[PDB]
Enzyme design. Structure first.
Site, PDB file in Angstrom:
ATOM      1  N   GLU A 163     -30.261  -6.761 -39.762  1.00 57.05           N
ATOM      2  CA  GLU A 163     -30.516  -8.011 -40.471  1.00 57.05           C
ATOM      3  C   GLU A 163     -30.661  -9.192 -39.517  1.00 57.05           C
ATOM      4  OE1 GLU A 163     -28.303  -8.067 -43.968  1.00 57.05           O
ATOM      5  OE2 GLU A 163     -28.847 -10.096 -44.599  1.00 57.05           O
ATOM      6  N   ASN A 168     -11.717  -8.504 -21.346  1.00 59.31           N
ATOM      7  CA  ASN A 168     -12.267  -7.426 -22.160  1.00 59.31           C
ATOM      8  C   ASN A 168     -11.758  -7.490 -23.592  1.00 59.31           C
ATOM      9  OD1 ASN A 168     -13.080  -6.837 -19.594  1.00 59.31           O
ATOM     10  ND2 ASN A 168     -11.872  -4.956 -19.397  1.00 59.31           N
ATOM     11  N   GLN A 205     -14.308  -0.417 -18.510  1.00 59.14           N
ATOM     12  CA  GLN A 205     -13.146  -1.284 -18.661  1.00 59.14           C
ATOM     13  C   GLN A 205     -13.206  -2.132 -19.923  1.00 59.14           C
ATOM     14  OE1 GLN A 205     -13.717  -2.844 -14.764  1.00 59.14           O
ATOM     15  NE2 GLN A 205     -11.666  -2.295 -14.037  1.00 59.14           N
ATOM     16  N   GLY A 224     -21.165   1.777 -16.404  1.00 59.85           N
ATOM     17  CA  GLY A 224     -20.625   1.021 -15.293  1.00 59.85           C
ATOM     18  C   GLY A 224     -19.115   0.871 -15.367  1.00 59.85           C
ATOM     19  N   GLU A 277     -18.335   6.140 -10.747  1.00 56.40           N
ATOM     20  CA  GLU A 277     -17.054   6.099 -10.063  1.00 56.40           C
ATOM     21  C   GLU A 277     -16.049   6.938 -10.833  1.00 56.40           C
ATOM     22  OE1 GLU A 277     -15.860   2.065  -9.700  1.00 56.40           O
ATOM     23  OE2 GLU A 277     -17.302   1.570  -8.122  1.00 56.40           O
ATOM     24  N   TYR A 325      -9.091  -9.350 -15.783  1.00 59.09           N
ATOM     25  CA  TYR A 325     -10.057  -8.612 -16.596  1.00 59.09           C
ATOM     26  C   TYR A 325      -9.398  -7.919 -17.786  1.00 59.09           C
ATOM     27  CZ  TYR A 325     -13.776  -9.155 -13.093  1.00 59.09           C
ATOM     28  OH  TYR A 325     -14.733  -9.658 -12.242  1.00 59.09           O
TER      29      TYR A 325
HETATM   30  N1  LIG Z   1     -16.405  -9.473 -17.572  1.00 55.23           N
HETATM   31  C1  LIG Z   1     -16.033  -8.396 -16.888  1.00 55.23           C
HETATM   32  N2  LIG Z   1     -16.797  -7.962 -15.826  1.00 55.23           N
HETATM   33  C2  LIG Z   1     -16.428  -6.866 -15.122  1.00 55.23           C
HETATM   34  C3  LIG Z   1     -15.281  -6.167 -15.458  1.00 55.23           C
HETATM   35  N3  LIG Z   1     -15.156  -5.132 -14.600  1.00 55.23           N
HETATM   36  C4  LIG Z   1     -16.196  -5.159 -13.735  1.00 55.23           C
HETATM   37  N4  LIG Z   1     -16.986  -6.236 -14.040  1.00 55.23           N
HETATM   38  C5  LIG Z   1     -18.232  -6.634 -13.365  1.00 55.23           C
HETATM   39  O1  LIG Z   1     -18.689  -5.589 -12.531  1.00 55.23           O
HETATM   40  C6  LIG Z   1     -19.224  -6.114 -11.336  1.00 55.23           C
HETATM   41  C7  LIG Z   1     -19.058  -5.137 -10.172  1.00 55.23           C
HETATM   42  O2  LIG Z   1     -19.634  -3.877 -10.451  1.00 55.23           O
HETATM   43  P1  LIG Z   1     -18.712  -2.728 -11.093  1.00 55.23           P
HETATM   44  O3  LIG Z   1     -18.927  -2.648 -12.585  1.00 55.23           O
HETATM   45  O4  LIG Z   1     -17.280  -3.081 -10.781  1.00 55.23           O
HETATM   46  O5  LIG Z   1     -19.074  -1.347 -10.345  1.00 55.23           O
HETATM   47  P2  LIG Z   1     -20.308  -0.388 -10.738  1.00 55.23           P
HETATM   48  O6  LIG Z   1     -20.989  -0.799 -12.022  1.00 55.23           O
HETATM   49  O7  LIG Z   1     -19.800   1.031 -10.834  1.00 55.23           O
HETATM   50  O8  LIG Z   1     -21.322  -0.536  -9.496  1.00 55.23           O
HETATM   51  P3  LIG Z   1     -20.880  -0.191  -7.983  1.00 55.23           P
HETATM   52  O9  LIG Z   1     -20.003  -1.274  -7.383  1.00 55.23           O
HETATM   53  O10 LIG Z   1     -22.129  -0.013  -7.156  1.00 55.23           O
HETATM   54  O11 LIG Z   1     -20.126   1.114  -7.996  1.00 55.23           O
HETATM   55  C8  LIG Z   1     -18.482  -7.418 -11.105  1.00 55.23           C
HETATM   56  O12 LIG Z   1     -19.362  -8.398 -10.608  1.00 55.23           O
HETATM   57  C9  LIG Z   1     -17.968  -7.830 -12.467  1.00 55.23           C
HETATM   58  O13 LIG Z   1     -18.676  -8.954 -12.932  1.00 55.23           O
HETATM   59  C10 LIG Z   1     -14.507  -6.597 -16.525  1.00 55.23           C
HETATM   60  O14 LIG Z   1     -13.487  -5.984 -16.830  1.00 55.23           O
HETATM   61  N5  LIG Z   1     -14.886  -7.713 -17.239  1.00 55.23           N
HETATM   62  N1  LIG Z   2     -26.408 -17.842 -57.734  1.00 55.73           N
HETATM   63  C1  LIG Z   2     -26.042 -16.798 -56.953  1.00 55.73           C
HETATM   64  N2  LIG Z   2     -26.690 -16.605 -55.777  1.00 55.73           N
HETATM   65  C2  LIG Z   2     -26.357 -15.579 -54.962  1.00 55.73           C
HETATM   66  C3  LIG Z   2     -25.284 -14.669 -55.376  1.00 55.73           C
HETATM   67  N3  LIG Z   2     -25.155 -13.748 -54.406  1.00 55.73           N
HETATM   68  C4  LIG Z   2     -26.073 -14.039 -53.452  1.00 55.73           C
HETATM   69  N4  LIG Z   2     -26.788 -15.129 -53.784  1.00 55.73           N
HETATM   70  C5  LIG Z   2     -27.872 -15.725 -52.972  1.00 55.73           C
HETATM   71  O1  LIG Z   2     -28.773 -14.701 -52.548  1.00 55.73           O
HETATM   72  C6  LIG Z   2     -29.078 -14.826 -51.160  1.00 55.73           C
HETATM   73  C7  LIG Z   2     -28.925 -13.470 -50.494  1.00 55.73           C
HETATM   74  O2  LIG Z   2     -29.728 -12.533 -51.197  1.00 55.73           O
HETATM   75  P1  LIG Z   2     -29.898 -11.042 -50.629  1.00 55.73           P
HETATM   76  O3  LIG Z   2     -28.590 -10.293 -50.687  1.00 55.73           O
HETATM   77  O4  LIG Z   2     -30.447 -11.065 -49.223  1.00 55.73           O
HETATM   78  O5  LIG Z   2     -30.962 -10.399 -51.643  1.00 55.73           O
HETATM   79  P2  LIG Z   2     -31.427  -8.877 -51.436  1.00 55.73           P
HETATM   80  O6  LIG Z   2     -31.976  -8.690 -50.042  1.00 55.73           O
HETATM   81  O7  LIG Z   2     -32.495  -8.532 -52.445  1.00 55.73           O
HETATM   82  O8  LIG Z   2     -30.243  -7.961 -51.628  1.00 55.73           O
HETATM   83  C8  LIG Z   2     -28.100 -15.815 -50.563  1.00 55.73           C
HETATM   84  O9  LIG Z   2     -28.818 -16.874 -49.924  1.00 55.73           O
HETATM   85  C9  LIG Z   2     -27.275 -16.339 -51.718  1.00 55.73           C
HETATM   86  O10 LIG Z   2     -27.371 -17.762 -51.763  1.00 55.73           O
HETATM   87  C10 LIG Z   2     -24.626 -14.945 -56.668  1.00 55.73           C
HETATM   88  O11 LIG Z   2     -23.703 -14.209 -57.074  1.00 55.73           O
HETATM   89  N5  LIG Z   2     -25.048 -15.997 -57.379  1.00 55.73           N
HETATM   90 MG   LIG Z   3     -20.167   2.744  -9.758  1.00 59.18          MG
END
Ligand SMILES: Nc1nc2c(ncn2[C@@H]2O[C@H](COP(=O)(O)OP(=O)(O)OP(=O)(O)O)[C@@H](O)[C@H]2O)c(=O)[nH]1
Ligand SMILES: Nc1nc2c(ncn2[C@@H]2O[C@H](COP(=O)(O)OP(=O)(O)O)[C@@H](O)[C@H]2O)c(=O)[nH]1
Ligand SMILES: [Mg+2]
Ligand SMILES: Nc1nc2c(ncn2[C@@H]2O[C@H](COP(=O)(O)OP(=O)(O)OP(=O)(O)O)[C@@H](O)[C@H]2O)c(=O)[nH]1
Ligand SMILES: [Mg+2]
Lengths: 99, 439, 426, 431
Positions: free
Chosen positions: B254, B228, B15, B10, B71, B224
């Site tokens: 995770e 972005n 953008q 889109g 577009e 915008y």
């Molecule tokens: N947050 C954010 N929204 C955007 C931005 N540019 C476009 N939009 C969203 O896009 C919507 C309009 O559709 P567009 O993405 O401009 O055009 P399109 O996806 O090609 O669809 P058509 O108009 O049918 O061609 C608006 O309602 C915006 O909310 C942007 O830079 N930031």
């Molecule tokens: N005591 C201690 N706890 C740790 C250490 N590093 C991580 N932990 C604990 O281990 C948990 C994360 O374990 P994790 O990385 O998911 O284990 P794994 O999935 O087996 O690799 C966290 O909640 C920490 O509190 C450390 O150096 N010392």
């Molecule tokens: Mg379009």
């Protein structure tokens, strides 16, 4: 027995140093004009000995052990740097009261 | 290794996928050209980018997302804008005629033309990755291609890939403001599809983000272009446990086990805190207690519903930054004592937390401030039945006088799908009420 | 010679096993490289229990590491002492569990159990005369509690006439972290009470109380909590590795603490835990050790022995001492608190001494006590299990993977009769 | 010690040959004069004592307008002038004219010149023949050339590149008439024969190569790269090599079946090659995609019974066997029950080279697949219906009858071809 182990370690280190010489010479020869394509060469010399991404064990001689135990795929472990501050074990022991 | 594929459907999807992928690039330091910074050639380099960025021997990191919209006008701004060299040319699928706010046109007639071209690229992005947890989906309810094309995308992807995870980030229509007219028809007729072909689904309301920006971040006239960024901040904090190291990690598998107690109940709600401007961030301290209190605050909730009228079902906490788990356990305990927040009687332990070391990053020109810690909450409750009851009343009074139906019946679909989506919604609301009744 | 094979299951088990191998390395004087840099000669005469010999005089831990996701194997490789562990001993997997006992026990741990059994059997058959096994795992996690009990049941069948220990991390009432942790834990203790000799209950809020009140620290990170846990794990095998006036092993402590096979849950405790500033004020003397050992502030299980009564008490002491202090003090605390001790058996205390104190310390003591107050923990988790299961909560994650609801019913009844016979001896 | 002779017939064969020999000279480093500015060229270039190299190709045609640009262009001095045989009056899209009336005037000259080339080669490895099913020179003159070549040379391999007529588009009206009376000749006078549909390359160049306006030169560059991967093992050493006798034995289960489908991968522009990483597991997936064949038929309707693989460049045999395994696990592709192991693998070290002004880009690993498939009965049953509705009320039969062939040869080819269609139907039945 200790003497033999030291001799084997020295021979392996000499072989790695010879590769480092060759690699540095080739990169220096290739990077004369531009450096826009030396990235694969730099990556290859910075791969590290063995298929490992962990930090080199400098006290072991730059060894990078590999960890591939995943069913039939055997993909190596990734590497991530830690923002947590480093700790000294003597400081931790003295803080926790074993002093 | 823990790759994650994004599906953005889109005009809302393409953008939101611009500001979200801009945050992804600046988080890992990806230059808009595509490569890593050349000055950072110092030895090392964490493999935290392979979950979002592909690898080439040249050093180029191609994102693993696909952008789909009927577009071509809004897709072509990506090919013209700053990131024209980062995105792959074949990963952005363009239609020829838009669905025009309709379900039938976007589902049966026009969506069938490009249902093969997108899924060919999906297979090419699925055999590229070794271990794929699942797909993230960004689409809007009110859009024609957001409703019609997604309602065949979910059904055919469930057959193509059996037990892969399906997270859903949906733009739900606001109860007061509206950019379209037939959006109750588009919203109702696709909830039957997302009832059985979605693993988890969050909801956001555009006017609910509007009050947050005008009241918290001290911006009077938002656009915008910053909404972005707020959604992309939410998706970043959810996935950052996969990307970066933590004291204890949470995966996409995770939390979906801890928030979905029943297959018909897979609708929790997202909430981000703190969202504070730069001139206000330097005044108040941001402790763990003062950021977990705003998540329970219904004013900070970004869906127009009140958990004070409802009852909490399950909770998920995503802590990011300089955070100590002692203060997390202390803040959880002090919330459990207060009787203003009501829990269900058969879920006494309804919490699950996650810890991340890296603080969130900001973007240049951004309206959020540089904070040291932040929290994202994914809480399930019964209060969505308030929003369902306030929308299907409007759907029932629209359909009483046989309005706008000739824009659907002549496109190929029959008329009995209106009544079967009406009856399915009534059974879902009865399902939520029976669960909310305690013994 | 008698050796200990160490088991590390789960992310919690890995993070406490890394700190366990951290502590006894300094106790035996082992550098991060792998060699030996010590001062005395008694630190090398019993090192084969925890370390296997290698070439060039290198020692590697006798441990295997079990987990289902690659997220935490990186941190046990990039840690300060991650380079000592064997690279072949890491056993990880593609797909994790994610706080699910059912996936960890039947559909994901059933394939990795073949690999880890091959690793542990290859190592254990290389032992000369194996003493026993030791397991560290958590009950609140998918992998440690899911296939960890599958590891227990498999090697009990394969090695009948052995001993195994477990340091189980039971969940906490106020520091609850998993929504479905009654499902992860009650289904585990049903498979744990049948085939375990010795069980240590380590609860997280107990460690939080010790770090906050007694040690007066402000930021108790998990690296701090695992040091308290590893103080007891090193404190239970002191007399096996160091000679003393009265040696005691795990089996000698086993035969004196369990009078019946279904009474094997204990309460670990460490006596010297004074705060950093209060150290200069407190004399380090035997009555000071035995006073702090019996304090309810030092218990590592979330129950109070005042509400119940002690069944059997074990004491393991460290440091060169005069034991005429340790016999008159334990007789004094036996005579004074007569109502807190059972009267159908006298002289309920087993005492052990060890000559070598831990590094940086002069005197130490370790407590292992069996009581009826453990039922307070068991009733607290059974009432949450009953209040959850009766409305079919979270059951589609469990009954859709092969197992029936009768496994829930028999886990209710086996735990109910276990606490019923705990009450019968009270 | 190994030598191959190229035979190009018709205007399509000449234009393909010029694009092929441009690639060959740039691959071996040959200036257009013919001299280099170490002995891999001996299979294709004859040796002169002065240092020049002469190709072993015979260009033949029956209209001088195609050969004239060869004698005028950049390679006017490179080719020997006796190798470019030119007729006087072309058959003009008539099989009967090119077989019974015109072809016998120059059949002495081309069979004499092929003897002079075969004299210089000590050991013949195979005759490559480029021909078109549509035009009269590629249909009529080619037909009795093999009938003479089958008795002139006994067992020497004669590999074939057919230009199969397009199913939906057309150059000619009588091109189904030409493309049927040659199937009788190519059953018992062809060893192996590859085929091509034109609009399939048109779809590949339009969609993959980002070329919205291609020419026949752009098709002939892609055809020439298909040719070069076959002879790459002949001219360059690899981890394990494949010869012309090798893959021709492992892909034909019967003498009546010698029609496989080639497919090249990766095909990509220099812009998208900067984006996409091209691993060997990623280039082998493009050989199975229904949108990326060079043949306009879908093998999902049929089933495979023989497959050949040609890997070139920086390739590792471990990832080849890993990628072969995961394709076998996929249930979208099907194999026959009587051939469980239908794979054959070839490895070459040298990466493929590219010409300036070309379409593709420099690549580090590429793959060519030679797969026999039941689905060519799909395209033939489509074309059989087109033939006999044209022949229902005897369209254009007066032109072929008046040349000198009798009227019974049309029905003779129909009752032959109906047996071969029945033959492929009973190959694909499961046991
Ligand atoms: N947050 C954010 N929204 C955007 C931005 N540019 C476009 N939009 C969203 O896009 C919507 C309009 O559709 P567009 O993405 O401009 O055009 P399109 O996806 O090609 O669809 P058509 O108009 O049918 O061609 C608006 O309602 C915006 O909310 C942007 O830079 N930031
Ligand atoms: N005591 C201690 N706890 C740790 C250490 N590093 C991580 N932990 C604990 O281990 C948990 C994360 O374990 P994790 O990385 O998911 O284990 P794994 O999935 O087996 O690799 C966290 O909640 C920490 O509190 C450390 O150096 N010392
Ligand atoms: Mg379009
Ligand atoms: N695939 C492919 N086919 C070609 C090409 N050029 C010509 N053809 C085929 O050749 C057929 C017509 O024959 P021509 O190549 O024009 O010349 P010819 O084969 O000598 O036949 P005549 O002109 O009658 O002598 C057409 O039907 C095309 O299919 C080409 O570049 N690529
Ligand atoms: Mg011609």
């Amino acid at each position: 027995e200790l003497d033999y182990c030291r001799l084997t370690e020295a021979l392996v280190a000499e072989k790695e140093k010879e590769f480092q010489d060759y690699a540095r010479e080739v990169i220096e020869l290739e990077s004369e004009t531009t450096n826009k394509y030396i990235y694969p060469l730099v990556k290859a010399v910075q791969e590290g000995p063995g298929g490992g991404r962990g930090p080199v064990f400098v006290d072991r001689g730059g060894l990078r052990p590999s960890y591939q135990a995943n069913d039939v795929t055997g993909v190596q472990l990734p590497f991530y740097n830690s923002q947590g501050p480093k700790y000294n074990f003597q400081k931790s022991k003295r803080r926790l009261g074993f002093t | 290794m823990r790759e994650c594929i994004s599906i953005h459907v889109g005009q809302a999807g393409v953008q939101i996928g611009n500001a979200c992928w801009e945050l992804y690039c600046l988080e890992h330091g990806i230059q808009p050209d595509g490569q890593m910074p050349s000055d950072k050639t110092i030895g090392g380099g964490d493999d935290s980018f392979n979950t979002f960025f592909s690898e080439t021997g040249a050093g180029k990191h191609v994102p693993r997302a696909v952008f789909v919209d009927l577009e071509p006008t809004v897709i072509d701004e990506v090919r013209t804008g700053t990131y024209r060299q980062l995105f792959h040319p074949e990963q952005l699928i363009t239609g020829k005629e838009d669905a025009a706010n309709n379900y039938a046109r976007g589902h049966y007639t026009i969506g069938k033309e490009i249902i093969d071209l997108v899924l060919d690229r999906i297979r090419k992005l699925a055999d590229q990755c070794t271990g794929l947890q699942g797909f993230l989906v960004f689409h809007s309810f009110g859009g024609g291609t957001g409703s019609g094309f997604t309602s065949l995308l979910m059904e055919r992807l469930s057959v193509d890939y059996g037990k892969k995870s399906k997270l859903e980030f949906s733009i739900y229509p606001a109860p007061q403001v509206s950019t379209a007219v037939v959006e109750p028809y588009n919203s109702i007729l696709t909830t039957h599809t997302t009832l059985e072909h979605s693993d988890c689904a969050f909801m956001v309301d555009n006017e609910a983000i509007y009050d947050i920006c005008r009241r918290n971040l001290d911006i009077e006239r938002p656009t915008y272009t910053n909404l972005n960024r707020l959604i992309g901040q939410i998706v970043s904090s959810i996935t950052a446990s996969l990307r970066f190291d933590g004291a204890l990690n949470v995966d996409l598998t995770e939390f979906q086990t801890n928030l979905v107690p029943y297959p018909r109940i897979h609708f929790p709600l997202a909430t981000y805190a703190p969202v504070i401007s730069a001139e206000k961030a330097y005044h108040e301290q941001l402790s763990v207690a003062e950021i977990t209190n705003a998540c329970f605050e219904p004013a900070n909730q970004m869906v127009k519903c009140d958990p004070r009228h409802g009852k909490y079902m399950a909770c998920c906490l995503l802590y990011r930054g300089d955070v100590v788990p002692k203060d997390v356990n202390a803040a959880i305990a002090t919330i459990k004592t207060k009787r203003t927040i009501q829990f269900v009687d058969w879920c006494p332990t309804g919490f699950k937390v996650g810890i991340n070391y890296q603080p969130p990053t900001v973007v240049p020109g951004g309206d959020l401030a540089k904070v040291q810690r932040a929290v994202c909450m994914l809480s399930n409750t019964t209060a969505i039945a308030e929003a369902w009851a306030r929308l299907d009343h409007k759907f029932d009074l629209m359909y009483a006088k046989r309005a706008f139906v000739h824009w659907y019946v002549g496109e190929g679909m029959e008329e009995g799908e209106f009544s079967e989506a009406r009856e399915d919604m009534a059974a879902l609301e009865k399902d939520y009420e029976e669960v909310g009744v305690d013994s | 010679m008698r050796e200990i094979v160490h088991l590390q299951a789960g992310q919690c088990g890995n993070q406490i096993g890394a700190k366990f191998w951290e502590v006894i390395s300094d106790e035996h004087g082992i550098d991060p490289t792998g060699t030996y840099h010590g001062d005395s000669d008694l630190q090398l005469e019993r090192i084969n229990v925890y370390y296997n010999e290698a070439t060039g005089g290198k020692y590697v831990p006798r441990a295997v590491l079990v987990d289902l996701e690659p997220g935490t194997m990186d941190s046990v490789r990039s840690g300060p002492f991650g380079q000592i562990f064997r690279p072949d001993n890491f056993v990880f997997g593609q797909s994790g569990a994610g706080n699910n006992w059912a996936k960890g026990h039947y559909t994901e741990g059933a394939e990795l159990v073949d690999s880890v059994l091959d690793v542990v059997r290859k190592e254990a058959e290389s032992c000369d005369c194996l003493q026993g096994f030791q397991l560290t795992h958590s009950l609140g996690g998918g992998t440690g509690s899911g296939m960890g009990t599958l590891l227990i049941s498999k090697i009990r069948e394969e090695y009948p006439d052995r001993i195994m220990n477990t340091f189980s991390v039971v969940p906490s009432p106020k520091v609850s972290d998993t929504v479905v942790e009654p499902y992860n834990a009650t289904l585990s203790v049903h498979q744990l009470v049948e085939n375990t000799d010795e069980t240590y209950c380590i609860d997280n809020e107990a460690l939080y109380d010790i770090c906050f009140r007694t040690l007066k620290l402000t930021t108790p990170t998990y690296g701090d909590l695992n040091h308290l846990v590893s103080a007891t794990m090193s404190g239970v095998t002191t007399c096996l590795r160091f000679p003393g006036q009265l040696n005691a092993d795990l089996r000698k402590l086993a035969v004196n603490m369990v009078p019946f096979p279904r009474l094997h849950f204990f309460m670990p405790g460490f006596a010297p835990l004074t705060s950093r500033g209060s150290q200069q004020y407190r004399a380090l003397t035997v009555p000071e050790l035995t006073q702090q050992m019996f304090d309810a502030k030092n218990m590592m299980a979330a129950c109070d022995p005042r509400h119940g009564r002690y069944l059997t008490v074990a004491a393991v002491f460290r440091g060169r001492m005069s034991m005429k202090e340790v016999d008159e003090q334990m007789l004094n605390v036996q005579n004074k608190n007569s109502s807190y001790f059972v009267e159908w058996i006298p002289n309920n205390v087993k005492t052990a001494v060890c000559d070598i104190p831990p590094r940086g310390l002069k005197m130490s003591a370790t407590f292992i006590g069996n009581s009826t107050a453990i039922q307070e923990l068991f009733k607290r988790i059974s009432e949450q299990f009953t209040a959850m299961f009766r409305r079919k909560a979270f059951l589609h994650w469990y009954t859709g993977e092969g197992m029936d609801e009768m496994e829930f019913t028999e886990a209710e009844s086996n735990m109910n009769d276990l606490v019923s016979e705990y009450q019968q001896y009270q």
